[PDB]
Design a protein around this ligand. Structure first.
Ligand SMILES: *[C@@H]1O[C@H](CO)[C@@H](O[C@@H]2O[C@H](CO)[C@@H](O[C@@H]3O[C@H](CO[C@H]4O[C@H](CO[C@H]5O[C@H](CO)[C@@H](O)[C@H](O)[C@@H]5O[C@H]5O[C@H](CO)[C@@H](O)[C@H](O)[C@@H]5O)[C@@H](O)[C@H](O[C@@H]5O[C@H](CO)[C@@H](O)[C@H](O)[C@@H]5O)[C@@H]4O)[C@@H](O)[C@H](O[C@@H]4O[C@H](CO)[C@@H](O)[C@H](O)[C@@H]4O)[C@@H]3O)[C@H](O)[C@H]2NC(C)=O)[C@H](O)[C@H]1NC(C)=O
Lengths: 213, 49, 218, 218, 211
């Protein structure tokens, strides 16, 4: 069975750049590819309903190609509208499969995260819950790793991360991580720290605080 | 009518749902043709032109 | 314009079960093969299931094949997806899209989609109880308060089954947290509160949790 | 025995949507009219939906008429019941019932019943948030913190729109409580922490619960 | 079609012959059925076509009537027969039910013994306060519990549960739990439970002062 080898997994560019992407089928199909855009948390939008075959109502900047095994998508000078994911699809009669989508994004130089750690407010803590927040305020590119340590003990399974998409004035990513603990468990330990690694950092960055200090 | 084309009439009854469904599906294609393709009426529009 | 409207998605537990549905507007599904798609937290689209025109053929992606069932209603224009014993990676946005074109054919792409509905399969399949004492302040009453356990049931005995007279173990109540709680009590002679030991044996077979709690005066 | 098993019970909110289903064994459903029934809070039954053989007719009680929708899918032996715009009086056990006999007729009782599944409609149709300050420790960061609300959105602004540079409001997270949380933040010159009084003007627009909170150094 | 059933509760002794009546608002011919329902169980069919006993249903169950008046007779109540029962009009593609009748073992009136329990320190340290009011060994089943905090009538923050009839003394018991966060419980001092019951000539209140 077919698997799609879409490349790259992320494309970096800017307004007015002409860009090309490529989906390569693991075994040959009869030019049964189509291409979609997807904006974050939205439904995908169909661009090209057969390889090189643009859907009506789609902006004329779009294009593509197909050879029965190797295929392309191309955009003829990106708009600020175009900085979304793009997915290839192979569609058979009663099944389909998709590429791991090419994320199109606004380019800049590498920038390391400014890291900040916030203890729980006393007002939260008296209710019985402690939410410790770690903020990576601005960085580029998107890929970063945050780990929590409580009394130098690497934590696992008690945190939730979300990343804001590219900032409108500098195109950096930002991450915040929330470590959640009942008031009981939080008052059991002293230091609460978050440790960060990223493309711009030569060594991990750790921010910490001592409970009550 | 199957006896008229020389096909033994039990070929209808043994296939009666298949034949009913192919008639119904083929009438469906007429709407798709005539709705989509204004050039299908080419003789009548030629006479009016 | 035409519309599709997914419904039923929300929080779920691993090895628990849910059913999605999709309604439509401005069109009839009776002409169309109808498909379920999802976007996992990893960001990629996965196809999930489809059901043909005339409800003839049902097909699935191999991660959900056998576990899920797709269904339809050509008259009121609804599609359904039963999700028996969900996996953690069944967590996704689940979209309902129609196979379609201006002129239909034996093979077309997905030309209209609904806004999608979120499903989250939380990984805690069973939760083991907490047990707390109901301390005795003639005849006195004491007991145990089993709490925060999922699914039912919990069994309770007292002194390993030697104390049965006067015992009431109540039906569980379902809390607004989605977790169960029940209390088991017993009345006994006040004179025995100093000498006799009272232990409630709480067994929760679904989590393989056993707790023996001794109940004594404060 | 004839085997029926319901699925898709649990908690729901007023104005919310759910889908029940039932599957079967030891019979094929196609020869039977199939029903849904519920047990309302007084311990009394109510009939809820019936779908005939071949899905010819669908009838409902007046309480659920136009709100709900029954469906069936005989080729896998399943029956479904959509419950859009649930209301607190829909809180009941629900069951999937076979209309039938040792010899089926044009009008019959309900013979085989599944063990049932519970549905609870909690009155929390618009649960208002809890809103809390994130206090500033050359550039400082401050903010506000929203917990425990449903449905979305909770909306936030800084000083009724007087502050906009450096403002971020994060996407909401679904907690294990089944309720949303989020946070809103702004970065400002540290020198202004003494002179400028930062405030966040908020609203849970579904409940129209308008909130304010001053954010100042601790 | 609409139906009425009487009595809503029928109290009787083992071995008795009892009748339960259903009345239809308009003639339904003999298109009526009868169902037995145990607590926590789906209903089981007893009779249909007004009098037709289902295969395997014991002969002590019988039904009669036509038009607007129907009766279910149980001739010699056995312990298994103390249950919920419901008359049910049925038509080609629909049905409707009456309000039901509950059949219980009769005994003398017994007033509840009332007990109130404050939240345990352990639970209270976790941030939640669950007081529990207990109504022990009362008969008949109807009882009303009202919670008052500082003389303030509570509403919407309590749940109740009731036992089935005790196998030895035929009484009921009831537990009511008032649930409040630690933040809301420490606000008010006295926590009371006002019980009314056929066995009480005036309501009984059990209370405690927080701390
Ligand atoms: C003598 O010859 C006749 C034919 O001349 C033979 O009859 C045919 O027998 C075939 C083999 O048994 C059957 O094929 C199988 O059918 C199932 C189900 O197919 C359904 O979809 C059909 C297509 O409908 C589409 O497409 C048309 C345009 O072509 C549109 O107008 C229509 O709206 C619809 O469009 C939607 O769906 C498309 C995808 O399907 C999308 O691309 C579109 O965008 C849109 O969403 C349809 O015509 C069929 O009609 C029914 O057929 C039933 C009988 O099969 C019948 O009960 C019913 O009344 C209807 O008439 C169906 O609704 C496919 O799933 C099969 O696919 C294969 O399955 C294999 C595994 O089982 C797999 O390995 C393989 O890879 C395939 O996936 C297969 O195609 C024909 O349906 C059947 N036709 C008729 C008219 O009966 C006859 O059997 C033969 N006899 C002998 C002894 O030789």
């Amino acid at each position: 069975d077919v698997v799609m080898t879409q490349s790259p997994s992320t494309l970096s560019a800017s307004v007015g750049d002409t860009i090309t992407i490529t989906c390569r089928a693991s075994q040959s199909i009869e030019t049964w590819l189509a291409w979609y855009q997807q904006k974050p948390g939205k439904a995908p939008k169909l661009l090209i309903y057969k390889a090189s075959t643009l859907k009506t109502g789609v902006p004329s900047r779009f294009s593509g190609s197909g050879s029965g095994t190797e295929f392309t998508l191309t955009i003829s000078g990106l708009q600020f509208d175009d900085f979304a994911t793009y997915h290839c699809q192979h569609y058979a009669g009663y099944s389909a499969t998709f590429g791991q989508g090419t994320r199109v994004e606004i380019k800049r130089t590498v920038a390391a995260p400014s890291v900040f750690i916030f203890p729980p407010s006393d007002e939260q803590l008296k209710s019985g819950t402690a939410s410790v927040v770690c903020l990576l305020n601005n960085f580029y590119p998107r890929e970063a790793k945050v780990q929590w340590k409580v009394d130098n003990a690497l934590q696992s399974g008690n945190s939730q991360e979300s990343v804001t998409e590219q900032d409108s004035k500098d195109s950096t990513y930002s991450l915040s991580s929330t470590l959640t603990l009942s008031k009981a468990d939080y008052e059991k330990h002293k230091v609460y720290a978050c440790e960060v690694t990223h493309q711009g950092l030569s060594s991990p960055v750790t921010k910490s605080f001592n409970r009550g200090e | 009518r199957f006896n008229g084309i020389g096909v033994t009439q039990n070929v209808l009854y043994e296939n009666q749902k298949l034949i009913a469904n192919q008639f119904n599906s083929a009438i469906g294609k007429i709407q798709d043709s005539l709705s989509s393709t204004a050039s299908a009426l080419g003789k009548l529009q030629d006479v009016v032109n | 314009e035409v519309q599709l409207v997914e419904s039923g998605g929300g929080l779920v537990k691993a090895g628990g079960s849910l059913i999605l549905s999709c309604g439509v507007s401005n069109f009839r599904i009776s002409a169309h093969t109808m498909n379920w798609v999802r976007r996992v937290p990893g960001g990629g689209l996965e196809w999930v299931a489809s059901i043909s025109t005339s409800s003839t053929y049902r097909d699935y992606a191999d991660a959900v094949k056998g576990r899920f069932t797709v269904s339809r209603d050509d008259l009121e224009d609804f599609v359904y997806l039963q999700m028996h014993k969900m996996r953690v990676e069944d967590t996704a946005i689940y979209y309902c899209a129609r196979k379609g074109s201006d002129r239909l054919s034996d093979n077309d792409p997905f030309d209209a989609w609904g806004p999608g509905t979120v499903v989250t399969v939380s990984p805690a399949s069973t939760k083991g109880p907490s047990v707390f004492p109901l301390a005795p302040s003639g005849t006195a009453a004491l007991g145990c308060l089993v709490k925060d356990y999922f699914p039912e049931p919990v069994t309770v005995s007292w002194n390993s089954g030697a104390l049965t007279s006067g015992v009431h173990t109540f039906p569980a109540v379902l809390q607004s947290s989605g977790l169960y709680s029940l209390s088991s009590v017993v009345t006994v002679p006040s004179s025995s509160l100093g000498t006799q030991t009272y232990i409630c044996n709480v067994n929760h077979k679904p989590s393989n949790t056993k707790v023996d709690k001794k109940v004594e005066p404060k």
